[PDB]
């Protein structure tokens, strides 16, 4: 289907038997969520925007259900102020820009 | 056109004669670009972002054009890591995300 820019695009993910709610993000090369505790490994990364950088923990091969579809891919973990789905998991459900 | 997301959607913008590159941002409500000088009055702007809050400067009604269509509208000018275009100006040359 086709998502009108007119508002936030706001899609709900299931990641980690939950439910959170995030914006499709073209700006944003990686998922960044809100602290939530996932499995397996991470690395610490430092991630810079507008305001400057954060500390998050990254974690790999993360298995999230957005729009229907059951993606794999990196997600961010820490205190980022709005919840982001980034172009490291939305090529994978086929989503490009249009116009 | 279609814009994939492997890569960062950096496009050529054109603002005040000169050229330069931008990012599509769909997570982002306005554009803001990097220092430069654009003419009339300016009002301040509070946005926050991924690191905190910032001052910018809020231009109004400025002609821009992205990947060579032309918009007219509110431009923010401030400590950005990267030129963005937001919703405000995707939505005046009817860009959208499909999938
Ligand atoms: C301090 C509190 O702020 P806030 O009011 C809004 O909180 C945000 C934070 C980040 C974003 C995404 C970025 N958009 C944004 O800043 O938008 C600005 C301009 O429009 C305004 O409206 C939305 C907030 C203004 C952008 O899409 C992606 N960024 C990169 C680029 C902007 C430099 S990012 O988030 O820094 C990022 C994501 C993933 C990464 O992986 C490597 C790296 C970096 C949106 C909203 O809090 C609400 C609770």
């Given amino acids: 289907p086709q998502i009108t820019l007119w508002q936030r695009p706001l899609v709900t993910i299931k990641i980690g038997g ?14 960044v969520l ?8 991470w690395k610490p990364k430092m991630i ?11 974690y790999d091969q993360i298995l999230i259900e957005i ?15 709005v919840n982001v789905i ?3 998991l ?4 086929g989503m490009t820009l249009n116009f």
Same sequence: chains 1, 2.
């Fill in 67 to 81: 729009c229907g579809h059951k993606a794999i891919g990196t997600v961010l973990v820490g205190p980022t102020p």
């Fill in 18 to 31: 939950q439910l959170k709610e995030a914006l499709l993000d073209t700006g944003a090369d990686d998922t």
């Fill in 34 to 41: 809100e602290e939530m505790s996932l499995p397996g490994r």
């Fill in 90 to 93: 939305m090529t994978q459900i």
């Fill in 86 to 88: 980034g172009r490291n």
């Fill in 48 to 58: 810079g925007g507008i305001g400057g950088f954060i500390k998050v923990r990254q």
